[PDB]
Amino acid sequence: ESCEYTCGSTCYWSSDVSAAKAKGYSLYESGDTIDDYPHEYHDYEGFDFPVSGTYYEYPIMSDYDVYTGGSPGADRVIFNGDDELAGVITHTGASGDDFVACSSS
Numbered sequence: 001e002s003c004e005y006t007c008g009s010t011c012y013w014s015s016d017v018s019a020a021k022a023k024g025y026s027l028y029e030s031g032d033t034i035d036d037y038p039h040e041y042h043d044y045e046g047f048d049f050p051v052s053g054t055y056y057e058y059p060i061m062s063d064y065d066v067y068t069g070g071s072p073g074a075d076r077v078i079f080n081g082d083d084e085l086a087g088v089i090t091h092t093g094a095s096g097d098d099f100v101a102c103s104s105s
């Protein structure tokens with residue numbers, strides 16, 4: 001139960017990531033949003049994503065619960081229209097409204 005990704009000091013397990021991607025994807029697929037998520041992620045930052053876009057972001061929570069509205073915190077899981085995982089990113093340690101990648105491999 002390793003940290004698939006680490007966001008700043010927050011440790012996310014593989015199971016945390018798949019639940020956040022699954023939640024954001026069920027909405028995406030249903031053409032719905034909750035407080036504006038998921039939404040297109042532009043990849044203004046220039047990240048590597050092992051998969052192809054269009055990319056969508058969904059909040060991944062610090063507390064391990066799936067996002068269902070409210071404050072999104074700083075972490076985001078990134079996925080595409082095929083329900084493929086692209087990665088986990090964070091606002092933590094990023095300047096203003098930029099994002100930095102969460103450590104992994």
Ligand SMILES: Nc1nc2c(ncn2[C@@H]2O[C@H](CO)[C@@H](OP(=O)(O)O)[C@H]2O)c(=O)[nH]1
Pocket residue numbers: 039040041042043044045057076097098099
């Ligand atoms: N930094 C960054 N922001 C984006 C991108 N695409 C959309 N955004 C938007 O600008 C703000 C992201 O910094 C995002 O709110 P967020 O905090 O929900 O991501 C979002 O609405 C992108 O590729 N990079």
